[PDB]
Short mmCIF file of all heavy atoms in Angstrom, two decimals:
data_model
loop_
_atom_site.label_atom_id
_atom_site.label_comp_id
_atom_site.label_asym_id
_atom_site.label_seq_id
_atom_site.Cartn_x
_atom_site.Cartn_y
_atom_site.Cartn_z
N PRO T 28 0.87 -1.22 -0.08
CA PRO T 28 -0.04 0.05 -0.01
C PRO T 28 0.83 1.27 -0.01
O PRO T 28 1.47 1.63 0.99
CB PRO T 28 -0.91 -0.10 1.26
CG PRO T 28 -0.08 -1.08 2.06
CD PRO T 28 0.69 -1.90 1.22
N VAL T 29 0.87 1.93 -1.08
CA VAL T 29 1.62 3.25 -1.28
C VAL T 29 0.80 4.25 -1.80
O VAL T 29 -0.33 4.11 -2.33
CB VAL T 29 2.92 2.97 -2.32
CG1 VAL T 29 3.80 1.97 -1.57
CG2 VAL T 29 2.41 2.52 -3.61
N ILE T 30 1.29 5.54 -1.86
CA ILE T 30 0.57 6.67 -2.28
C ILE T 30 1.54 7.59 -3.01
O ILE T 30 2.69 7.85 -2.56
CB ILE T 30 -0.19 7.32 -1.19
CG1 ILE T 30 -0.99 8.59 -1.72
CG2 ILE T 30 0.72 7.68 0.08
CD1 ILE T 30 -1.81 9.20 -0.59
N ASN T 31 1.16 8.15 -4.06
CA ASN T 31 2.02 9.22 -4.77
C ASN T 31 1.46 10.52 -4.25
O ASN T 31 0.19 10.86 -4.54
CB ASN T 31 1.87 9.15 -6.35
CG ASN T 31 2.77 9.98 -6.89
OD1 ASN T 31 3.95 10.31 -6.53
ND2 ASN T 31 2.57 10.37 -8.15
N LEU T 32 2.29 11.32 -3.53
CA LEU T 32 1.67 12.53 -2.94
C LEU T 32 1.40 13.65 -3.85
O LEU T 32 0.40 14.28 -3.65
CB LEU T 32 2.54 13.00 -1.79
CG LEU T 32 2.76 12.03 -0.61
CD1 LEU T 32 3.66 12.68 0.50
CD2 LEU T 32 1.54 11.54 0.07
N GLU T 33 2.20 13.74 -4.84
CA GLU T 33 2.03 14.81 -5.86
C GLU T 33 0.74 14.66 -6.68
O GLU T 33 -0.04 15.47 -6.79
CB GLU T 33 3.28 14.81 -6.68
CG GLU T 33 4.52 15.59 -5.99
CD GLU T 33 4.68 15.20 -4.51
OE1 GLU T 33 4.05 15.82 -3.59
OE2 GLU T 33 5.55 14.39 -4.32
N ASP T 34 0.60 13.41 -7.22
CA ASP T 34 -0.73 13.16 -8.08
C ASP T 34 -1.84 12.87 -7.14
O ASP T 34 -3.04 13.07 -7.48
CB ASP T 34 -0.50 12.02 -9.04
CG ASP T 34 0.29 12.29 -10.20
OD1 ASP T 34 1.60 12.19 -10.15
OD2 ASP T 34 -0.25 12.59 -11.27
N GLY T 35 -1.62 12.43 -5.91
CA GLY T 35 -2.62 12.09 -4.97
C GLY T 35 -3.15 10.68 -5.30
O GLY T 35 -4.30 10.39 -4.76
N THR T 36 -2.45 9.88 -5.98
CA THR T 36 -2.97 8.62 -6.24
C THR T 36 -2.61 7.71 -5.16
O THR T 36 -1.55 7.67 -4.58
CB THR T 36 -2.46 7.98 -7.71
OG1 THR T 36 -3.30 6.94 -8.15
CG2 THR T 36 -0.93 7.62 -7.64
N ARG T 37 -3.41 6.88 -4.68
CA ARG T 37 -3.29 6.03 -3.61
C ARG T 37 -3.67 4.56 -4.07
O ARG T 37 -4.71 4.40 -4.60
CB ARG T 37 -4.12 6.49 -2.51
CG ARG T 37 -3.90 5.72 -1.17
CD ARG T 37 -4.71 6.34 -0.07
NE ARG T 37 -4.54 5.59 1.25
CZ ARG T 37 -5.32 5.63 2.33
NH1 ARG T 37 -6.45 6.26 2.13
NH2 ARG T 37 -5.00 5.11 3.43
N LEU T 38 -2.81 3.74 -3.67
CA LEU T 38 -2.96 2.31 -4.19
C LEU T 38 -2.86 1.45 -2.97
O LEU T 38 -1.70 1.24 -2.47
CB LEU T 38 -1.90 2.07 -5.18
CG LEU T 38 -1.76 3.09 -6.41
CD1 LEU T 38 -0.65 2.84 -7.08
CD2 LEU T 38 -3.19 2.93 -7.27
N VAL T 39 -3.93 1.06 -2.43
CA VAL T 39 -3.91 0.12 -1.24
C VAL T 39 -4.68 -1.13 -1.61
O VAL T 39 -5.46 -1.20 -2.69
CB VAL T 39 -4.61 0.82 -0.04
CG1 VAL T 39 -3.70 2.08 0.44
CG2 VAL T 39 -6.04 1.29 -0.26
N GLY T 40 -4.45 -2.18 -0.82
CA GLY T 40 -5.20 -3.44 -0.98
C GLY T 40 -4.85 -4.06 -2.25
O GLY T 40 -3.70 -4.39 -2.57
N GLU T 41 -5.75 -4.33 -3.20
CA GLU T 41 -5.50 -5.05 -4.48
C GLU T 41 -5.04 -4.08 -5.55
O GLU T 41 -4.46 -4.53 -6.51
CB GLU T 41 -6.73 -5.82 -4.91
CG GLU T 41 -8.04 -5.12 -4.96
CD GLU T 41 -8.67 -4.72 -3.72
OE1 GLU T 41 -9.39 -5.49 -2.99
OE2 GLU T 41 -8.51 -3.59 -3.21
N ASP T 42 -5.35 -2.79 -5.26
CA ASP T 42 -4.76 -1.79 -6.29
C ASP T 42 -3.38 -1.39 -6.10
O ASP T 42 -2.78 -0.77 -6.75
CB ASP T 42 -5.67 -0.61 -6.34
CG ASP T 42 -6.96 -0.68 -6.86
OD1 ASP T 42 -7.88 -1.17 -6.29
OD2 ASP T 42 -7.17 -0.51 -8.18
N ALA T 43 -2.94 -1.86 -4.92
CA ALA T 43 -1.54 -1.63 -4.55
C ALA T 43 -0.71 -2.50 -5.38
O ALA T 43 -1.02 -3.67 -5.77
CB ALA T 43 -1.33 -2.10 -3.02
N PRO T 44 0.57 -1.96 -5.77
CA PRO T 44 1.62 -2.71 -6.54
C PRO T 44 2.10 -3.92 -5.87
O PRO T 44 1.95 -4.17 -4.54
CB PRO T 44 2.78 -1.77 -6.79
CG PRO T 44 2.51 -0.79 -5.58
CD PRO T 44 1.11 -0.60 -5.36
N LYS T 45 2.61 -4.90 -6.62
CA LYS T 45 3.14 -6.16 -6.08
C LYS T 45 4.54 -5.99 -5.54
O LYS T 45 5.11 -5.05 -6.04
CB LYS T 45 3.17 -7.15 -7.22
CG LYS T 45 1.77 -7.30 -7.91
CD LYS T 45 1.99 -8.18 -9.10
CE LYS T 45 0.76 -8.22 -10.05
NZ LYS T 45 0.82 -8.91 -11.16
N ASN T 46 4.87 -6.61 -4.63
CA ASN T 46 6.21 -6.52 -3.89
C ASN T 46 7.36 -6.77 -4.87
O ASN T 46 8.45 -6.08 -4.79
CB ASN T 46 6.32 -7.54 -2.68
CG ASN T 46 7.63 -7.39 -2.01
OD1 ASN T 46 8.64 -8.14 -2.29
ND2 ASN T 46 7.73 -6.56 -1.04
N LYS T 47 7.21 -7.50 -5.87
CA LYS T 47 8.08 -7.68 -6.95
C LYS T 47 8.29 -6.31 -7.81
O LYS T 47 9.44 -6.01 -8.12
CB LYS T 47 7.91 -8.87 -7.82
CG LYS T 47 6.50 -8.87 -8.53
CD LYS T 47 6.20 -10.13 -9.32
CE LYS T 47 5.12 -10.05 -10.23
NZ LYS T 47 5.32 -9.05 -11.27
N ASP T 48 7.19 -5.78 -8.18
CA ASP T 48 7.21 -4.59 -9.01
C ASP T 48 7.46 -3.36 -8.19
O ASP T 48 7.73 -2.26 -8.75
CB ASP T 48 5.81 -4.46 -9.68
CG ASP T 48 5.49 -5.44 -10.75
OD1 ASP T 48 5.24 -6.56 -10.49
OD2 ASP T 48 5.46 -5.05 -11.98
N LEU T 49 7.33 -3.44 -6.88
CA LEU T 49 7.54 -2.40 -5.89
C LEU T 49 8.79 -1.52 -6.17
O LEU T 49 8.63 -0.42 -6.36
CB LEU T 49 7.41 -3.05 -4.45
CG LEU T 49 7.72 -2.27 -3.20
CD1 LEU T 49 9.14 -1.87 -3.05
CD2 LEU T 49 6.87 -0.92 -3.20
N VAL T 50 9.81 -2.15 -6.28
CA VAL T 50 11.03 -1.57 -6.49
C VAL T 50 11.05 -0.79 -7.82
O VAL T 50 11.75 0.38 -7.96
CB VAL T 50 12.22 -2.59 -6.52
CG1 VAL T 50 12.45 -2.98 -5.07
CG2 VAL T 50 12.12 -3.65 -7.46
N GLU T 51 10.52 -1.23 -8.81
CA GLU T 51 10.44 -0.65 -10.17
C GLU T 51 9.45 0.54 -10.10
O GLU T 51 9.76 1.58 -10.64
CB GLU T 51 9.96 -1.71 -11.14
CG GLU T 51 11.02 -2.78 -11.42
CD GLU T 51 10.68 -3.76 -12.51
OE1 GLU T 51 10.56 -3.34 -13.60
OE2 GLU T 51 10.61 -4.90 -12.20
N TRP T 52 8.35 0.27 -9.45
CA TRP T 52 7.38 1.37 -9.40
C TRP T 52 7.93 2.59 -8.62
O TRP T 52 7.72 3.72 -8.91
CB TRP T 52 6.10 0.90 -8.58
CG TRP T 52 4.92 1.73 -8.63
CD1 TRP T 52 3.90 1.66 -9.58
CD2 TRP T 52 4.45 2.73 -7.77
NE1 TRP T 52 2.97 2.59 -9.35
CE2 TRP T 52 3.25 3.23 -8.25
CE3 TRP T 52 5.03 3.39 -6.61
CZ2 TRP T 52 2.68 4.32 -7.57
CZ3 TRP T 52 4.38 4.42 -5.89
CH2 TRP T 52 3.14 4.84 -6.48
N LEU T 53 8.80 2.20 -7.65
CA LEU T 53 9.40 3.23 -6.74
C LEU T 53 10.47 4.07 -7.61
O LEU T 53 10.52 5.26 -7.40
CB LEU T 53 10.22 2.60 -5.62
CG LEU T 53 9.50 2.30 -4.38
CD1 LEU T 53 7.98 2.07 -4.66
CD2 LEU T 53 10.07 1.27 -3.53
N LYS T 54 11.07 3.57 -8.56
CA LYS T 54 12.03 4.26 -9.41
C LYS T 54 11.18 5.22 -10.37
O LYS T 54 11.77 6.14 -10.81
CB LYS T 54 12.96 3.32 -10.17
CG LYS T 54 13.83 2.79 -9.21
CD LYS T 54 14.99 1.81 -9.86
CE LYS T 54 15.94 1.28 -8.97
NZ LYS T 54 16.80 2.40 -8.37
N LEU T 55 9.96 4.73 -10.68
CA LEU T 55 9.15 5.56 -11.54
C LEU T 55 8.48 6.74 -10.66
O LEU T 55 8.14 7.67 -11.33
CB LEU T 55 8.10 4.74 -12.29
CG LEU T 55 8.52 4.02 -13.55
CD1 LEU T 55 8.82 5.05 -14.72
CD2 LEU T 55 9.72 3.06 -13.34
N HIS T 56 8.36 6.55 -9.49
CA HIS T 56 7.70 7.51 -8.63
C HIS T 56 8.66 7.90 -7.34
O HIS T 56 8.50 7.37 -6.30
CB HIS T 56 6.42 7.03 -8.12
CG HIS T 56 5.27 7.01 -9.12
ND1 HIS T 56 4.48 8.05 -9.43
CD2 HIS T 56 4.92 5.89 -9.83
CE1 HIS T 56 3.69 7.66 -10.36
NE2 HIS T 56 3.88 6.39 -10.68
N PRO T 57 9.59 8.84 -7.56
CA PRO T 57 10.55 9.26 -6.50
C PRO T 57 9.70 10.18 -5.48
O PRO T 57 10.22 10.61 -4.51
CB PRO T 57 11.66 9.96 -7.29
CG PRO T 57 10.98 10.42 -8.57
CD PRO T 57 10.02 9.38 -8.93
N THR T 58 8.52 10.55 -6.01
CA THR T 58 7.59 11.40 -5.27
C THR T 58 6.59 10.55 -4.39
O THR T 58 5.57 11.18 -3.87
CB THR T 58 6.95 12.35 -6.12
OG1 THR T 58 6.41 11.60 -7.26
CG2 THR T 58 7.89 13.44 -6.75
N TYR T 59 6.76 9.36 -4.36
CA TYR T 59 5.81 8.49 -3.68
C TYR T 59 6.17 8.41 -2.14
O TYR T 59 7.23 8.90 -1.70
CB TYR T 59 5.86 7.06 -4.26
CG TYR T 59 6.70 6.05 -3.56
CD1 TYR T 59 6.08 4.98 -2.76
CD2 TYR T 59 8.12 6.20 -3.50
CE1 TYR T 59 6.83 4.21 -2.05
CE2 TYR T 59 8.85 5.36 -2.73
CZ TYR T 59 8.18 4.33 -2.06
OH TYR T 59 9.05 3.42 -1.32
#
């Protein structure tokens, strides 16, 4: 469960990214 503060997009539960993709998503969102 993560949230991008700038866009205000919040992804929790099933909309939350997978732990495997987590690191990749993080590099795409340094503002998360």
Side-chain angles (χ1 to χ4, degrees):
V29 297
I30 179 177
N31 191 27
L32 298 181
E33 281 47 273
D34 284 83
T36 197
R37 185 179 183 197
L38 308 169
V39 297
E41 54 289 279
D42 287 86
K45 306 173 186 175
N46 180 267
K47 62 185 190 65
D48 290 70
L49 175 281
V50 292
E51 293 184 61
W52 194 89
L53 271 35
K54 292 181 174 294
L55 277 294
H56 292 271
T58 48
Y59 95 110

